[PDB]
Amino acid sequence: PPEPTIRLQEDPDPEDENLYEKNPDSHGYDKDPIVDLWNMRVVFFFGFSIVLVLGSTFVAYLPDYRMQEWARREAERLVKYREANGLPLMESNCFDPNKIQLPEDED
């Protein structure tokens, strides 16, 4: 069996490289310290300072396009009107029956 016991010419599997040996204060972003530091800074500034704070403030103070206060005030004025005249609050029929034309069965 003169086979070399090697299936092919393969590079040996490299060992994992640690970013902390060649650069303490490594931030885990890049091997180049300057690119590393600036990547950390841009990530922190645009993620935490810009989006997370300003976007949260923007969402918090969104104008009432869902018309919650409008609906509340409409309901208050309507119930004030109906309590005054004694109408029985909300009617059971959403649409008035006189404008509906039922089909006569005659069965």
Partner 1 sequence: MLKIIIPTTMLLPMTWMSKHNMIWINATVHSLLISLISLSLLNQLGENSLNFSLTFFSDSLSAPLLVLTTWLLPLMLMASQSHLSKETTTRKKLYITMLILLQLFLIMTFTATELILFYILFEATLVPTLIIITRWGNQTERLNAGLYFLFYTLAGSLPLLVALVYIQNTTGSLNFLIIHYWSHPLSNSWSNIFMWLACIMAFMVKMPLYGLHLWLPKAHVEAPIAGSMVLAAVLLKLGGYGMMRITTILNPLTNYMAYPFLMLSMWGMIMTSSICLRQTDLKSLIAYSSVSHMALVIVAIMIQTPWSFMGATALMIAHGLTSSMLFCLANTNYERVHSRTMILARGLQTLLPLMATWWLVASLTNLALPPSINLIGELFIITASFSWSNITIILMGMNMMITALYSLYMLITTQRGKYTHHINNIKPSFTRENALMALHILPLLLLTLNPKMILGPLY
Partner 2 sequence: ARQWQPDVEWAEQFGGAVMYPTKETAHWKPPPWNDVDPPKNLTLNFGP
Partner 3 sequence: LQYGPLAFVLGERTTRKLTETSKVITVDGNICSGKGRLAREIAEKLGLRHFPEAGIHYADSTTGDGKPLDVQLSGNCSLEKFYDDPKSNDGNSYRLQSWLYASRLLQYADALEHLLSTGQGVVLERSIYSDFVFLEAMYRQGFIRKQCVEHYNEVKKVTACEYLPPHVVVYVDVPVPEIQSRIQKKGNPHEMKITAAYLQDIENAYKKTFLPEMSEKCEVLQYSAREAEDAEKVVEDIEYLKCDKGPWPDQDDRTFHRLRMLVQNKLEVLNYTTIPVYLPEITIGAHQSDRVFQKFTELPGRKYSPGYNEDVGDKWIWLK
Ligand X SMILES: CCCCCCCCCCCCCCCCC[C@@H](O)O[C@H](CO[C@H](O)CCCCCCCCCCCCCCC)COP(=O)(O)OCC[N+](C)(C)C
Q: DSSP per residue over 43-101, as a string?
A: HHIIIIIIIIIIIHHHHHT---TT-HHHHHHHHHHHHHHHHHHT--SS-S-SS-GGG--
CB 36 within 8 A of CB 29: yes
Identify which of residues 44 and 81 has a Cβ nearer to ligand X in the complex. 44
Integer CA distances (angstroms), 72 to 30, 37, 81, 83, in order: 55, 52, 14, 16
Which parts of this chain interact with ligand X (CB under 6 A)? Answer: 51-52, 55-56, 59-61
- We find the least distance from the C-beta atom of residue 96 to partner 1, in angstroms, to be 23
Question: Which of the listed partners (partner 3, partner 2, ligand X, none) does 15 bind, with a CB threshold of 5 to 8 Å by partner kind?
Answer: partner 2
Question: Which of the listed partners (partner 3, ligand X, partner 1, none) does 26 bind, with a CB threshold of 5 to 8 Å by partner kind?
Answer: partner 1
- We find the least distance from the C-beta atom of residue 8 to partner 2, in angstroms, to be 6
Q: Which of residues 11-70 bind partner 3 (CB under 8 A)?
A: 11
Identify which of residues 13 and 104 has a Cβ nearer to partner 2 in the complex. 13
